[PDB]
Design a protein around this ligand. Sequence first.
Ligand SMILES: CCCCCCCCCCCCCCCC(=O)O
Ligand SMILES: CCCCCCCCCCCCCCCC(=O)O
Lengths: 129, 129
Amino acid sequence: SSFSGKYQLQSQENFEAFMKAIGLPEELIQKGKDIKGVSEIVQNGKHFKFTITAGSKVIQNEFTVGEEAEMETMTGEKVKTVVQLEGDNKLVTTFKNIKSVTELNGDIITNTMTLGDIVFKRISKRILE
Amino acid sequence: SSFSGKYQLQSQENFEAFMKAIGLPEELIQKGKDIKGVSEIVQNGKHFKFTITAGSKVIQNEFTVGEEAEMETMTGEKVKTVVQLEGDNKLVTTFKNIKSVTELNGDIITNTMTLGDIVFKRISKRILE
Ligand SMILES: CCCCCCCCCCCCCCCC(=O)O
Ligand SMILES: CCCCCCCCCCCCCCCC(=O)O
């Protein structure tokens, strides 16, 4: 129903493989690969504010689903894309050659990003406040 | 007694002036000044693990009070210093020309970093799980 919350990374798969494929330096990959931080989502209807802890970087993006928005990626590149809400619990977008699916089930968010044959998956749990 | 917990930044003073003084790139100052992230402390006796969200960077440091430690600073430089316990609720250290005081008051942490005539203050609040 609502994505709002603070989410603690629990586990992830193919962080190093994904970050290498998009061109992150090995130095940043090694620094960030073991960080299990907290991301925050604030949802207000179709409007979302994301404060994402991804490795050693914090990225803060904002968008209304269905509207074109400029979003900062891991590389620092700002891409223009549209994020759609599928049902009430799935955010889906494409940018460059990446497909991204953010799915909320109960208190668990599963983020799946697909680049070629690499499936980068993050599983995070809502902090119960 | 224990610093352990996750803390969300509530307010801060003189971020830009302090970051300019230590030489952070202007582009990182502008993107980081408005981020209100979550920092995590894990304390085991005199041993501390810090996962700090500062602006758009995540910094992970470990140390034992009273022992010389190698710590990463906001610029990425590693410094060697000793962190002391003042009382039971203050961590105090000096490195280069900076004095840092981390004070725990119930659910509030206040971090004060003095560089010459600039006092960079951060106030954070424990996330109640
Ligand atoms: C699409 C713009 C953001 C690009 C950053 C990609 C790195 C992973 C993003 C996953 C965040 C999705 C929200 C769930 C919480 C989390 O996994 O931190
Ligand atoms: C000693 C240098 C550590 C890294 C420098 C980053 C600058 C901000 C450090 C403040 C962290 C103090 C921990 C309390 C929680 C917080 O304020 O995030």
